[PDB]
Design a protein around this ligand. Structure first.
Ligand code: HEM
Ligand code: HEM
Ligand code: HEM
Ligand code: HEM
Ligand code: N8E
Ligand code: TPF
Ligand code: TPF
Lengths: 445, 447, 448, 449
């Protein structure tokens, strides 16, 4: 009993498929699925990675417990950012607890005065950098800018932004992001070489933790209130009565800012790219309807329970081109999947990038269509993952994407300068090709 | 001949990096003291001989490219310049390319740069410093002014509509991001699949398509040919000694090299100077500076800044003497060079540090003191903020043009005040400047 | 939960290697003495904890693969075994594979092995030691006799026609050229464009095509179905995984190379050492007692003569391995923390048992540098782990001992030996540790 | 005043054409030569290498003095084997004298009893290893073994082979060669990595040096009687005298003896092998026939003369094998001063190369290039054949080498016939010295009955 998933042919003797796969990740798998079916095994530098390409077996990957499927080792290449013993790095229970701490820091109830704050930053930026009747900009960069500004304005209190504003923090982030080497998942060793990056990362992170400390100690003096994400983590308590270290606190914060930064920016950038695509005049018009009925100053309910189509666009761009191409786990205990049995020590993966393309659940995959149904196949859509490690920021993330859309589209139109941007898979968080993201903007004179 | 003294305390495979990393300047200061000006570090199996003896600077800046070559030591910048450009190009191709740029930067090319610079510096202040007073990050604001004043001076109008200063400084970041100076000692780093590496290529590619985009339109519109040459136009006119023209690839690479070069160094200089100018200790220097500028009208002309601003230059030059933006100039020894009593073998990396040399107490007594009145020629050849000899900075004139001009304009309308102890230099970055976070300052105008 | 001491004196990025490489045994002898049996070295930024406490051996050999895994620590050998074979393969896949080889080496598979071993050993003697007396390198000669006897026993007649023991010895060399054990601590080594890595690739390719061309040729001739004395290849071709499927020609080639490589070096070293000690003046009594045991035997030995009636010969071989174990460092990757003695070894750490170190423990093996066949191996139950223990315990022990024993009994029945200098000292700079080859010149004597 | 050769398109960001090149060098270059012409420029990890593919300009690569075109930096990857300051690692004048010292040790006047010794080792091995009516062997390995045996027998004196035999020596060559990483030419930093191979090499060369030394201090004591002496290679490199009146150092001696043995080993065996493989190929029946006629005449104990000047076709076979698949596939030089090549100019700092592999496929100079024809005209285009290089560094072992290959061919085929068991081997371009893919060299030998 227990059959093994087919190992993809044409595997180099020792380097595996890392080259074949790297060049064209989507095509590689997309083809591979046809020759061997949904479930198949890649050999990446001696590593067995088995992808769940069958959309009907997703629950098999998102359901099992950490004891069977584990994310600790797979995501260890991020330790430099989070810090040692933080998040995934820590033991499961410790990890479980910490992730939760952040989760509740991003729940609807904590969205007080977030909509206005987002609206405030988006407009200050627009009235700062798009002050001409019409102008040429890189929408990917400008969204990344607007996104970080609004993310900080919401999760950071006033005293924190004064000593460390949005533009300065971004700098710390990039310095810490410069040591994130995703190939480290297949080359754990590369994380042990003498690298300058990992030095600049220790610094940047150490600088942040210093500020935080110097703000906590400042609050502890002025203590003798709109509690932000910071004050939120400093209050949380473990199951044994102890609190988080400033090291742990600093780690979660960074994780939150990184996590929400690129995904939200990409999910916004895409949409805009689609909505401004001539083939979408339909969706663009409908959207304007949905928001033309809104006043200048938006409120919580306005975007949460009254912008369904907007959310559909946000959720459709993520279905077409998922920011996270490959969700991985370490198989600690053998798991039945389809007609196959993925063995222990193997690397098991569900690719949002892949599954999203199954013509069965998503016929005509390469067409950006908000209208199409996401539930057509249950568990098929995994843009925010599912089960144990479901995105705990989906709500907060959608809030931004949507509020930024509304804001931008209410005041500006857009046109493409060339063919639609094609996804670039050479980045940890996948987004449209930056060099293909040059666009013109129409002001509403 | 005998080899220099190899500073002891070397680790099995690391070498001195660990200790050099912690403090480069301190490390050398200590070494020079113990071993003398000429000593040898070992950086990951790589031998690097620094010319600490200030008297021997010419031994470094003088020899021809046959003996000393910057080609292999500057390759890590290929991602910025592009394949086969600048250093990444054949030796003679490098010389010709660098000349073409040197010619595009001669004083003869500064006709309305003065007015341009002031315009941008007055649009920024009136837009970012409008309150009676306020707190800001000077280093960040000077950077913004510098890229603006550069793009306004070197970039034609038709080019600036496709890519304004802001969006250009945007593409620089994405390209500077890939830069890994350490690659000089750990070459395999470049061979490693790193995101940054992809970043740079795409950023450079984006600037590439705009330039070409811009170019051909110029040819189409070029038909009338009846009546102001920018940098892009100048380069496109350069013809090699073999009768061929630079390729759009080479034209792009050179423009980036120019902008990248003048962007960081110019802002770092302008900023430092300002910081020293607002320090209590330097009350006298600030007073003398105003006198020199108080005489000038609203609109400054080329002469005013160049010939009639001698102390301004001394301040800027002194700011580069104290905290030199380019801390380590390197070369590859292709043939043994006699330095002092010593002889540097071939294959060895020879280095002159404007940072270490600018601390020489003989040449610069009270080194950590910012004194515009000090004598730079005390030891002829000591100061090398602009490198020297064969590879002397080809943008010194244009650079000083901005700095001096920018200061005259800002200080004419504003005063400044520190918010803490004067920032310390941050050595972690490829172009050394004052620690960013320490650069918040308050501004004041006294109409 | 307390960590084992980290032996002090570590350079920044190198670790203890430089020191350890100079002298591994001396380093572990010095460590063990200072910090106690359980300690931790650093090897190029890799924590490696050696279970030197000879009373804690079970805590290394016993844990299940989930906890302690050999898979990654043995991946530098992939170029030899092949992609997804043996260690490279998934654990279930692996465990089954090794069991197949296991079953092809049970004592039930020694039908005419003894006679085959003698024939070779006598063919070699009468071809290379024909003079009244002569000078020879006994290590080199034992290597030949061992590869000849192994091939004779395991390879069918058709296989040996295409690839004789000499030809196969070549392939082994070509293949074991790449191996870079250091790849264990410096993995990127395997990524570099090294000549070695291509050589392996090609050599295993050669052996690969011959096995395949032999198989398809056995299938055509199979049309007759005449009685065939199934060889090692035959048996593996007859193995079936729990999932019904059969071993591929690739995996079949791997297990054959695996066994041949494993037995060739360890068998020859054990043989040579034993001969070396037996000819050492200090061991006149031991040689004398050995002859007594084998004088009673006839020209043609049988399975029972060597198995149940050569207990002192085996002792000699077993004590040779106790003194100078061929496999010096057994390693595992720690997946889940393990309680060892008082200490706890954290996950991500490499755990090791060094037979070499363990076999020197004075409480277990007093006067440890003395080759004493009379010594008690079980003085401290568990101390001796020449053949490993627990889950991965050697599966060729019996077959290996069969050879060493049968060979000793043949050689010493017709020959005597004298050293030409001080007894050879082990050379630790090889993947499998044996006596120094250059110190291996020896004088032989015809008996009669 | 000059034009730069075209640079081939499609360059990967940091690895250049390295991946494409590595796959199929011959093809890559062939296609490049086609698209761009004989003189083109590849980019190997930021390194510009210009290949003189125009078989008419070969002289512009082999001629120039060292000051213009230098082999030092290009050949520094062999330093671990020759040693610091030896051979190319040395200063040119120093270098030249050392090669000279080796040259005069390999001239034809030193060969009287070479032929007989060669035959002896070849036969000893055949009767030792091919003593059956017919058998299956890897002709590559076996020729390798015979070649290393004969070489030693010819250059080492008895007292040495006593202390050192061809089996032990080959064992040291192996150890040392394990550090020869050709790629190190483009990726020098490679040689600075903590690799165990470089330690194994230090130890092999230091062990060989000690052996040689104990032999020398012995030849200096056994000296007093001064018994009749036939000096071996070692004896000769001990008498050589620099222009400054000083003698080589045991380190320098240890290097040259090693460089000689290495250079002589692989090429001799690769050429002998290929030859044998082509002769056993059914398509070359007439060539195999013509060869048997040239040797049949000779007696068992071949003589220096009859092998030197009475075995012409036998030599043409060795020389056409080298022309088809040159062992040394890429001859490089560092350009210190620019050089005019054809219309183009090769700039300083650039790596320049002459590819025997590429030039040898020139349809004009060698029509039907992939066809092994020993009757072809090698001079059809004067200068086109460069298997033994030319000019400043032309092979000094050419004559000693051919002497081996030919004598080995005459001995082997006199008693044995061969049949391929598969298709003609294809060259394996993944080794420092290029030969037939070893795994494809299994062949059937047949005792002449
Ligand atoms: C709309 C944009 C977003 C997308 C498309 C997205 C996508 C995902 C996906 C696919 C996963 C599952 C990863 C896996 O299976 O290993 C995940 C998990 C996670 N996300 Fe996001 N995410 C988004 C926004 C955010 C935001 C805004 C935050 C916080 C501010 C965040 C924080 C997290 C965290 C902490 C987890 C791990 C949860 C756990 O391990 O239990 N994400 N996200
Ligand atoms: C005012 C601040 C500046 C300082 C302190 C400075 C400093 C230097 C130094 C020390 C060198 C020689 C370094 C070496 O030997 O590698 C150099 C060369 C160079 N500089 Fe600057 N520079 C400044 C402004 C500029 C500007 C505005 C440009 C505009 C293009 C520029 C472009 C260049 C170029 C292209 C070279 C290379 C010339 C060669 O290879 O010989 N620099 N500079
Ligand atoms: C007679 C001298 C021998 C000695 C001293 C010896 C030693 C050892 C040792 C200590 C181990 C365990 C290594 C570890 O735990 O990592 C082992 C495993 C092994 N040996 Fe041997 N061995 C000998 C002969 C043989 C022979 C004749 C064969 C047959 C080809 C063989 C095949 C194997 C195999 C296949 C394993 C792996 C088993 C597993 O991983 O479960 N050995 N040997
Ligand atoms: C047929 C077999 C041989 C071939 C195909 C061959 C080929 C070559 C080639 C092409 C060169 C030029 C290398 C360059 O330009 O950098 C060369 C140089 C050299 N060869 Fe050979 N060779 C052979 C036999 C030998 C023999 C028998 C020896 C004797 C030890 C030898 C020793 C040398 C030496 C010392 C050099 C360098 C000479 C110098 O730098 O001036 N070779 N060989
Ligand atoms: C992802 C594409 C497929 C290839 C995957 C790996 C590619 C690696 O390219 C070459 C990397 O070379 C690694 C060299 O690392 C050298 C380690 O140096 C460590 C420090 O050395 C001195 C002190 O130990
Ligand atoms: O899931 C990520 C890490 N991701 C990047 N590569 C593979 N997975 C980011 N992503 C998830 N939500 C939003 N972005 C993450 C998970 C947890 C976390 F704290 C940060 C973080 F980036
Ligand atoms: O020409 C070689 C070096 N060769 C190896 N890679 C590239 N060229 C060998 N070759 C030349 N003749 C015979 N073999 C050589 C040159 C000089 C030397 F001393 C040794 C040596 F192998």
């Amino acid at each position: 009993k227990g059959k093994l998933p087919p190992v993809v042919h044409g595997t180099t003797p020792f380097v595996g498929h890392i080259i074949q796969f790297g060049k064209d990740p989507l095509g590689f798998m997309l083809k591979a699925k046809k020759k061997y079916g949904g479930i198949f095994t890649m050999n990446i530098c001696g590593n067995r990675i088995t992808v769940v390409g069958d959309v009907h077996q997703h629950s098999k990957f998102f359901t099992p417990r950490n004891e069977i499927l584990s994310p600790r080792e797979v995501y260890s290449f991020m330790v430099p950012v989070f810090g040692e013993g933080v998040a995934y790095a820590a033991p499961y229970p410790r990890m479980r607890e910490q992730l939760n701490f952040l989760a509740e820091e991003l729940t609807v109830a904590k969205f007080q005065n977030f909509a206005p704050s987002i609206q405030h930053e988006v407009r200050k930026f627009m009235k700062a950098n798009w002050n001409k009747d019409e102008g040429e900009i890189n929408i990917l960069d400008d969204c990344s800018a607007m996104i970080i500004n609004t993310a900080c304005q919401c999760l950071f209190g006033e005293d924190l932004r004064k000593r460390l504003d949005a533009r300065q923090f971004a700098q710390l982030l990039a310095k810490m992001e410069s040591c994130l080497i995703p190939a480290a998942v297949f080359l754990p060793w590369i994380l042990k070489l003498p690298l300058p990056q990992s030095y600049r990362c220790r610094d940047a992170r150490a600088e942040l933790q210093d500020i935080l400390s110097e703000i906590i100690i400042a609050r502890e003096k002025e203590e003798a209130n709109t509690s932000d994400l910071l004050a939120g983590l400093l209050g949380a308590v473990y199951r044994d009565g102890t609190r988080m270290s400033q090291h742990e606190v600093c780690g979660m914060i960074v994780a939150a800012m990184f996590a929400g930064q690129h995904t939200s920016t990409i999910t916004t950038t895409w949409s805009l790219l689609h909505l401004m695509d001539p083939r979408n005049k339909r969706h663009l018009a409908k959207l304007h309807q949905e928001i033309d009925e809104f006043p200048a100053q938006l409120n919580y309910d306005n975007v949460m329970e009254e912008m369904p189509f907007a959310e559909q666009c946000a959720r459709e761009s993520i279905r077409r081109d998922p920011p996270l191409v490959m969700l991985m786990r370490k198989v600690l205990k053998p798991v039945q999947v389809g007609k196959y049995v993925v063995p222990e020590g193997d690397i098991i993966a569900c690719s949002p990038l892949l599954s999203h393309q199954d013509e069965e659940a998503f016929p005509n995959p390469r067409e950006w269509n908000p209208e199409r149904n996401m539930k057509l196949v249950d568990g098929a859509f995994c843009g925010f993952g599912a089960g144990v490690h479901k995105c705990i920021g989906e709500k907060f993330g959608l809030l931004q994407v949507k509020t930024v859309l509304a804001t931008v589209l209410r005041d500006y139109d857009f046109e493409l300068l060339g063919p639609l941007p094609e996804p670039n898979y050479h980045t940890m968080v996948v987004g449209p090709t930056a060099s293909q993201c040059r666009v013109k903007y129409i002001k509403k004179k």
